[PDB]
Amino acid sequence: PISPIETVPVKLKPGMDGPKVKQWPLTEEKIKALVEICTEMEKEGKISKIGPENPYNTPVFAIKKTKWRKLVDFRELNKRTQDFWEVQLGIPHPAGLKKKKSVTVLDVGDAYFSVPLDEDFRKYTAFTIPSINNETPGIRYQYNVLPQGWKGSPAIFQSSMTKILEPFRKQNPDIVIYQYMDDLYVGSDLEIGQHRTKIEELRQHLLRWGLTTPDKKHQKEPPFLWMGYELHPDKWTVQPIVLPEKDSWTVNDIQKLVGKLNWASQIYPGIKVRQLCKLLRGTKALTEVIPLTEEAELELAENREILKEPVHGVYYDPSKDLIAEIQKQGQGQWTYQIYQEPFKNLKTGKYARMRGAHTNDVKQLTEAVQKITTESIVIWGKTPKFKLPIQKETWETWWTEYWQATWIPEWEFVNTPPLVKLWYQLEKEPIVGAETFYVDGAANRETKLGKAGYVTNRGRQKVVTLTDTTNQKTELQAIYLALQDSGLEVNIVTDSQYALGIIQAQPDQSESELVNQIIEQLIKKEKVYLAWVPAHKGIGGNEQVDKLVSAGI
Amino acid sequence: PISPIETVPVKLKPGMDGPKVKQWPLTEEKIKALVEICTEMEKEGKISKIGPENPYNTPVFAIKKTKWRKLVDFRELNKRTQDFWEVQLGIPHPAGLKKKKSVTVLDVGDAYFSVPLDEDFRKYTAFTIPSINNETPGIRYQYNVLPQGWKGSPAIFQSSMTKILEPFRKQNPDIVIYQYMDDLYVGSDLEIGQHRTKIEELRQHLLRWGLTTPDKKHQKEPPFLWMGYELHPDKWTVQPIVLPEKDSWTVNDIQKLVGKLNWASQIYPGIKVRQLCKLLRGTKALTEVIPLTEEAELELAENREILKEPVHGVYYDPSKDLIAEIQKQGQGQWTYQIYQEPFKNLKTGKYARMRGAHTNDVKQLTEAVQKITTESIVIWGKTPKFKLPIQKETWETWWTEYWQATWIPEWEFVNTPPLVKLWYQLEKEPIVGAETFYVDGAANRETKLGKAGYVTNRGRQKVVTLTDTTNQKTELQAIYLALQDSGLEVNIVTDSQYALGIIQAQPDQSESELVNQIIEQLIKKEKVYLAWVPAHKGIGGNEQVDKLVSAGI
Amino acid sequence: ETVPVKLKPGMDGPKVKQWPLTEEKIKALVEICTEMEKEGKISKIGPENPYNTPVFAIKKSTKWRKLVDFRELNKRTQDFWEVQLGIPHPAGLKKKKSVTVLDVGDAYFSVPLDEDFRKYTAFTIPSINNETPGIRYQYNVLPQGWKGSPAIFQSSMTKILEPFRKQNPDIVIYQYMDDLYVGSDLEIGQHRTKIEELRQHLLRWGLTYELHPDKWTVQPIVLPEKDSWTVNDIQKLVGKLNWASQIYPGIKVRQLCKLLRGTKALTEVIPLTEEAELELAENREILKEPVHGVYYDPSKDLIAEIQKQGQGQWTYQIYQEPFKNLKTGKYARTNDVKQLTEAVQKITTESIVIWGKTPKFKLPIQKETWETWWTEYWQATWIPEWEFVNTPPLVKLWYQLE
Amino acid sequence: ETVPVKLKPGMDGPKVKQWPLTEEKIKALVEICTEMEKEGKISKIGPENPYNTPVFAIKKSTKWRKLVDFRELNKRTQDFWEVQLGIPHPAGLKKKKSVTVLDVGDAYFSVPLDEDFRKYTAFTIPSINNETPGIRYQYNVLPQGWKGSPAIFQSSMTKILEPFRKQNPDIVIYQYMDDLYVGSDLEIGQHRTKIEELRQHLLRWGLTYELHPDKWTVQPIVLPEKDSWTVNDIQKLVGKLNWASQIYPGIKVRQLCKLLRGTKALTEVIPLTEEAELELAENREILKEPVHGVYYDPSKDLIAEIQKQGQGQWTYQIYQEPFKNLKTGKYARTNDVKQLTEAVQKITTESIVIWGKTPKFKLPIQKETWETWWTEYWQATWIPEWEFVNTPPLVKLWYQLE
Ligand SMILES: Cn1c(Cn2ccc(C(F)(F)F)c(Oc3cc(Cl)cc(C#N)c3)c2=O)n[nH]c1=O
Ligand SMILES: Cn1c(Cn2ccc(C(F)(F)F)c(Oc3cc(Cl)cc(C#N)c3)c2=O)n[nH]c1=O
Numbered sequence A, B: 001p002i003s004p005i006e007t008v009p010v011k012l013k014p015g016m017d018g019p020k021v022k023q024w025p026l027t028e029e030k031i032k033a034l035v036e037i038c039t040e041m042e043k044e045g046k047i048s049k050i051g052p053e054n055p056y057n058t059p060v061f062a063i064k065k066t067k068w069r070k071l072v073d074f075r076e077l078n079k080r081t082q083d084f085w086e087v088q089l090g091i092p093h094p095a096g097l098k099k100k101k102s103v104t105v106l107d108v109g110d111a112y113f114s115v116p117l118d119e120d121f122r123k124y125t126a127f128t129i130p131s132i133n134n135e136t137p138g139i140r141y142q143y144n145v146l147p148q149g150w151k152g153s154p155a156i157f158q159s160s161m162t163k164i165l166e167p168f169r170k171q172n173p174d175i176v177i178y179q180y181m182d183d184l185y186v187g188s189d190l191e192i193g194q195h196r197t198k199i200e201e202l203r204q205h206l207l208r209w210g211l212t213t214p215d216k217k218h219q220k221e222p223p224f225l226w227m228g229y230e231l232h233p234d235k236w237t238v239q240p241i242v243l244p245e246k247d248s249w250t251v252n253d254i255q256k257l258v259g260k261l262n263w264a265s266q267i268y269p270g271i272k273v274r275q276l277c278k279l280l281r282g283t284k285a286l287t288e289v290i291p292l293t294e295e296a297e298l299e300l301a302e303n304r305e306i307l308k309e310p311v312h313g314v315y316y317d318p319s320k321d322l323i324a325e326i327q328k329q330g331q332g333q334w335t336y337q338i339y340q341e342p343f344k345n346l347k348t349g350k351y352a353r354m355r356g357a358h359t360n361d362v363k364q365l366t367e368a369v370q371k372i373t374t375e376s377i378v379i380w381g382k383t384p385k386f387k388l389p390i391q392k393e394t395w396e397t398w399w400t401e402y403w404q405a406t407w408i409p410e411w412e413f414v415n416t417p418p419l420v421k422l423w424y425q426l427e428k429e430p431i432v433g434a435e436t437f438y439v440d441g442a443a444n445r446e447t448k449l450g451k452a453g454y455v456t457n458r459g460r461q462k463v464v465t466l467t468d469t470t471n472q473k474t475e476l477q478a479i480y481l482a483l484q485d486s487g488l489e490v491n492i493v494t495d496s497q498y499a500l501g502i503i504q505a506q507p508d509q510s511e512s513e514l515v516n517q518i519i520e521q522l523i524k525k526e527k528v529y530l531a532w533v534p535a536h537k538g539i540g541g542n543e544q545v546d547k548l549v550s551a552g553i
Numbered sequence C, D: 001e002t003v004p005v006k007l008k009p010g011m012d013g014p015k016v017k018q019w020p021l022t023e024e025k026i027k028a029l030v031e032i033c034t035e036m037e038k039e040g041k042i043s044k045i046g047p048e049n050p051y052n053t054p055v056f057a058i059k060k061s062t063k064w065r066k067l068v069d070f071r072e073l074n075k076r077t078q079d080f081w082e083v084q085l086g087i088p089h090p091a092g093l094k095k096k097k098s099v100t101v102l103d104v105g106d107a108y109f110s111v112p113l114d115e116d117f118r119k120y121t122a123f124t125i126p127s128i129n130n131e132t133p134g135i136r137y138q139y140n141v142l143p144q145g146w147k148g149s150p151a152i153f154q155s156s157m158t159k160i161l162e163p164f165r166k167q168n169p170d171i172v173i174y175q176y177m178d179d180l181y182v183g184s185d186l187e188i189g190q191h192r193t194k195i196e197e198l199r200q201h202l203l204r205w206g207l208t209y210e211l212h213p214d215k216w217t218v219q220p221i222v223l224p225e226k227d228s229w230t231v232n233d234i235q236k237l238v239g240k241l242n243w244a245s246q247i248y249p250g251i252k253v254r255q256l257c258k259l260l261r262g263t264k265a266l267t268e269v270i271p272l273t274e275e276a277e278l279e280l281a282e283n284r285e286i287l288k289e290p291v292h293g294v295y296y297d298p299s300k301d302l303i304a305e306i307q308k309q310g311q312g313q314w315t316y317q318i319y320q321e322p323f324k325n326l327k328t329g330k331y332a333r334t335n336d337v338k339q340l341t342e343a344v345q346k347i348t349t350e351s352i353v354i355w356g357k358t359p360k361f362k363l364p365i366q367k368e369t370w371e372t373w374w375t376e377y378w379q380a381t382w383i384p385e386w387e388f389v390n391t392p393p394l395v396k397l398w399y400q401l402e
Helices: A028-043 A075-080 A153-171 A192-207 A251-264 A274-279 A294-308 A361-380 A392-401 A471-485 A497-504 A513-524 A540-549 B028-043 B075-080 B153-171 B192-207 B251-264 B274-279 B294-308 B361-380 B392-401 B471-485 B497-504 B513-524 B540-549 C023-038 C071-076 C078-084 C148-167 C188-203 C231-247 C254-259 C274-288 C336-355 C367-376 C393-398 D023-038 D071-076 D078-084 D148-167 D188-203 D231-247 D254-259 D274-288 D336-355 D367-376 D393-398
Strands: A047-049 A060-064 A068-072 A102-107 A127-129 A139-143 A176-180 A183-188 A224-226 A229-231 A236-238 A323-330 A333-339 A345-351 A385-388 A411-413 A435-443 A450-456 A461-466 A489-494 A527-532 B047-049 B060-064 B068-072 B102-107 B127-129 B139-143 B176-180 B183-188 B224-226 B229-231 B236-238 B323-330 B333-341 B344-351 B385-388 B411-413 B435-443 B450-456 B461-466 B489-494 B527-532 C042-044 C055-058 C065-068 C098-103 C123-125 C135-139 C172-176 C179-184 C303-310 C313-319 C325-332 C360-363 C386-388 D042-044 D055-058 D065-068 D098-103 D123-125 D135-139 D172-176 D179-184 D303-310 D313-319 D325-332 D360-363 D386-388
Touching (some): A075 B294, A153 A176, A323 A361, A333 A361, A361 A385, A361 C367, A435 A471, A450 A540, A461 A471, A471 A497, A471 A513, A497 A513, A497 A527, A527 C231, B028 B060, B028 B068, B028 B139, B060 B127, B102 B192, B251 B274, B251 B294, B323 B361, B344 B361, B435 B540, B450 B471, B471 B489, B497 B513, B497 D393, B527 D231, C023 C065, C023 C135, C055 C123, C055 C367, C098 C188, C148 C172, C179 C336, C231 C254, C231 C274, C303 C393, C336 C367, D023 D123, D055 D123, D071 D078, D098 D188, D148 D172, D148 D188, D179 D336, D231 D254, D254 D274
Parallel strands (some): A323 A385, B385 B411, C360 C386
Antiparallel strands (some): A047 A139, A060 A068, A102 A183, A224 A229, A323 A333, A435 A450, B176 B183, B229 B236, B323 B333, B435 B450, C042 C135, C123 C135, C303 C313, D042 D135, D172 D179, D313 D325
């Protein structure tokens, strides 16, 4: 059964002509198998016989199981075929589905074969069943339907199915038709009666357009085991997850484990993968065994505990609003839950990213909010109302004072420790009755040797020497030096915009241990006033500390 | 059945005392289920009843399927238990197994339970079945055998099984006993008769030490489906690999695909994952769809072709030598095969790494040789003889002239294109009748603005301005500038050890597009002589180009 | 009668992905597009069209409008609209006391689009939770947002404006994309009357703020006036002045640098000298006037940099060569993204008026924040090119106000 | 009678993984260990020992020897062997005309090891293809390779050496790890006779090259002697001299720098001046003598840097402060790893003789190459600490020879 639908006019890439790939002579068993198969296909209208006037060729192979299957190597035709529009933007998410009284799963039968192919394109799908020891002219065919393995098949199928459903979608607007690959997912809030009736009008309308679907007896019933999920009639979950137990974990065993955990994190709250991902760093062989660290073993144990009892997700109610709750889990780890009615979760998730080298929890929380917002727009067409573990005062202080434009949509504070806060604040003006440290750092580009030091207005001085260092590393050393030797109240003068930049952004975590040591000093202090001067312009204490660090550079 | 073997003296971590974790009151169904299970275990000698004089406690849970199972949360005991020696160094590789006439698979029955536990440690495994609504003193037990989920169980089991096998290993040195988890893999070159006889003496010797194994009827027969491999009697392979076909590939679908391909690359030659791994970069959501690039689609197609027909691996012959053949596949991609008899492969593999920012094929080949050497020592206890796609002249030129100590063990050239070669060579001395370019680059640390230029001995001059640049970027711009404006023969004078370093190592590929443009210029040239001078020491043309670049910095 | 449009050789049409849109915006677009299709302005398309341009819904008024992002298609058709059919930019427009902006985009619906170019105008209406594939369409007529539309239509625009121009020879009319910029030296009442008159001329052909560019006075780099100056204050001043010398030729700072001698406390009061005060004033007089030596090169791209000053104020600079400022300014007046959106539109309008080109923006915001939210406050029918930057800590300080 | 050994508080014993070994080396170790176990020197151990130290098999002679890498255990027991039981280093040893090295490691087999320290000496014999778990063992006696062994045994060593020392008061004997360094000013025949005499004293207690340290003359930084000098050659010379000034105090280069004026060709001949030649010779005379101001700080680690010079030659420098060279030198004489191994042992021997400490090596080789192969050529009973570096392109040039 092949659809009477208007074909899609396919073209080849500009400046390109069809494939002319020589057929490799095959064994006798392969040639017979292919003749059997091609005669049957030709009989059903799938392929049609051609003459040797057609100049194109695409290779063919036959493979066994004890049934024979025809394989066509469409690599060359695909390289020459035009680009098509991207099939899907993304995949449906269960948490995005409404609760429907009745739901029918309709898998289209031999989908690609039920769809014609542009007349003027058919020639380029030419293939040759070779004769025994390639002595006589081989049998030559071309496709009439969409060939399997060809670049344009997914796209043309989907568009034909779209054109076909278009009128029925007008006739029944209260019927949900999800289009996914060669499947239709039909949901309605009618009684079993009117539903089975509505399914049949669709099945029939589909048949008028040469498309076959299963009947009430061959029709699947919930729970649907779709794409790694279980779709029950009033709940959803991820499919059974089994975490293996090993004496020795290879790179492959951990990669697989991380994947299953990540997949489980869509509905099971508090899944953590940090310590486990840390092991996969500095990549060794796939069969190579990685010893589990205590922190990785503890992470695996905590996960094992979450998964022991099964958790499910709820469906979407378009009338009720969406609430997103976020919690800080640990070292750059965040976890969230989206519900409408507390605490019946539509979905869960995690955020554990590194947007830079130096950040704080305020930036990480803002980043997580953005990511949840985006995801919500995709799944539900709207933004959630957030419940965040940050006081409105902490947020307002941060955003007003920060150089970067930042925004969180409708949100409200929720006392769920650990709370997100700023761990120190720089002074807006210099401290009276505080020693002024003029810091500097210089490193030789050749020797990679550097010097870090300070000169104070109280006469004090210091210089340390550093090996295999940079100017940036020495400029941070000089600030740290100034924080180590000063009291609880300092005025620091640097000529480094780089270090100034880092510190002013109020980081609490860093990829640098030097920046982490600086952070600890800043938290211990009562008052710190950082200021900047241009370098090599003969400015105060800065010219003095400059000659001090430049010695032996 | 519990082994009469001498126990292993377990300790707690210094300064730590046992767990005292309160038992959570359970439902009646859970308490009954646990009493049923614990009475049975106690009857078999697995657990023994204690009094409330013991101060330790570990939580217990019961879970259903319709059978009830006892779960013990040993997280706290594990945190307090001593560290043990690492169970296995790595996992056996099939290509490392000899071809044995007869092979028996012996899975030990309830392994952990068949092994006692240190008397003085038993107390710390205390658990409490709570009473109904925690009213009366709960039932209290402690383990006598190795508990499941406890930190020391894998280690103590393996060492007990080692001590047990030790005498039998003396009595039968010609019998291969592979120890893996709670399994023994026994192979010999005896006739079916003497083998079945030898298996029984082992089974009996094991039983004298309270360890039960299956009998001839319950004994598994080849092909063995072990750890993702198929162990046939004279060949081995990876287990069936099915590459899914999708309209839309999510981050999760690609991660799973890369994994299966990587696993297939152990025996299927020429597997490529570069383009597919490129897609996984700049990490998006696990359910987020990634559009396949043309280069990724081509890579997927090529892989699909390799896998269509099944490939197997051969076993190891200790008398014959090992040959490793390496081929350059593409953009930092390498593939290898290890055989003894051409071309009957023991195993295959790939190398596609980035050991730095700038490399060449000579460094990559040396890196691949090292990795194969290591792997061979692990699997077979010896190094292979290499067949490399590099002429002995190219290798000798490279190693003699390179600053780094480098070595390839016994190797021989094989003409298998693409051949590995050096694409350019710097002059050992300055060129007569060639223009001398004195190059320099300077960038302001504050503005991030830079200037790149040159001054020649032929009077020529040039200066370009750069945005959001560094000194390193400007110093490479200045060299590129000098290569763009010069003829086929140049003498370049830089003050940058950094750029000097890169170029002298003769790179052909780089993480920098600037370094790649420089590379193209160097290949086009006939002669290039690079030299270095100290900066800011008032040297020749260098002081002139220094004032030129310093303008507006 | 269609004008044949050609892409730069080796350059293919846009293949830009569609941003997720809210239910509200999707419904608004389905209704708009259902009507344009009924009127034959756009047609549903097949999979054989691999091209795509993003579509959004704005308010611009309490009615939903369709905004198409032709930024990619514009760069790819650059030859056609800039050299083949360029709309010259009048230098007089920036000189007028009042400039009014009128949307003329509805004029493009009349003129059909070259049948062979239509595929490049493809766009998709997304679908919540990927229920359905998107609704795909391409243009049959000149589209709003494509720079090629006014390029083709400029001959038809000249005929429409011929009487009005002839009767008001001192009125400058300039067409940028979907808008008409109308400048005059008339009193505000007379100007507003001539705009209403011009709208009547447009009304006969189916076509249905003010800005005061003479009053566009650049914000100079401001130096403080003080009684007592601390070490901290002189250090802040030398910092600000040392940087201004990169832009302005003739900035001296040695007399100020002289005061800063030895390892001193920042809080310590330092007395002013006669030559330091003279240097302070000579630089103060320079910053007042525009920077000497900076000229617009019509072959180079314009860049705009914006800094968040807090308290609802934003500063900006427009240049082609970094620090070689063609214009400087400020924007004032809740929401950081709304305020930023607002400043972006203001700066763009000023650049269209002064040079006939939009600048490439360096935005002090995260890509994702900006991408999720800019459409909630955007009201212009064009979209400038943008990139995301991490503002240097000192640039904000050096461009501060009072 | 056992001496109680204690780790630094908060510091646990070594948990170092075992390197894959070839079948040949595994068999060699199984046979060695089977015998040591029979003699009660080592015992098979249980899983309750979480500690591990790498084991290797060398040749050092055509007989396989067991080498245990106690580098980690040594750093962890540093307090015991350095301050609690330190073996003083004689300053006179480096002054003797001949120093002979004798292995005394077999002496440690007699003395039992503190029962509570034994667990820390754990090591594994690996298994090809992970057939079996490794064969695990720990020491019952003082182990060869652990710095605590000569520390404990030094009282027993003094008794053994008391007669020989008393009869040869001008013979210096020093114990470093498993070796005895014996120095004298006697003629080579007399020296060799006194060594044979000393071996007899050792032979009564169960104990069974030469170096010429007076002849250790540091390779100075060599400046070329030339008729005609090109621009290239002066540039190479100023480069070499500018760097030497960082090490040597009193290096002048301005007279040489003077010659390099204007944008000139590298191949162009430049004539020498009277003051340039005087500067060239004054620096030449300085490099001859050792660097003034550099002294060994016994509290700091020693570092050794090695450069590959090609043609079988290698240069090296020993310092504690970068470029503050305590010693410089060269090694000459196939295989890069073999040659490097050879130089490493030579430099280490010289450092043990001069300071009583091994230096931390910066090796111009890939971690993996070095780790796979160093054991094929290693003959010393100790192992120095090492790291892998990417040699600066110019350091090789500046330390070159003739
Ligand atoms: C299970 N279920 C529900 C949830 N639900 C709601 C609506 C639809 C609709 F038909 F509209 F697509 C569903 O159909 C789907 C959708 C997808 Cl993405 C995959 C599969 C499969 N295999 C089936 C659906 O599963 N509501 N009631 C009930 O029984
Ligand atoms: C299959 N096979 C062979 C190859 N071979 C050779 C030796 C052994 C020996 F017993 F020694 F371990 C084998 O036993 C193993 C080893 C491992 Cl790692 C896993 C499994 C499983 N499940 C079985 C073995 O499979 N030779 N002959 C033949 O039939």
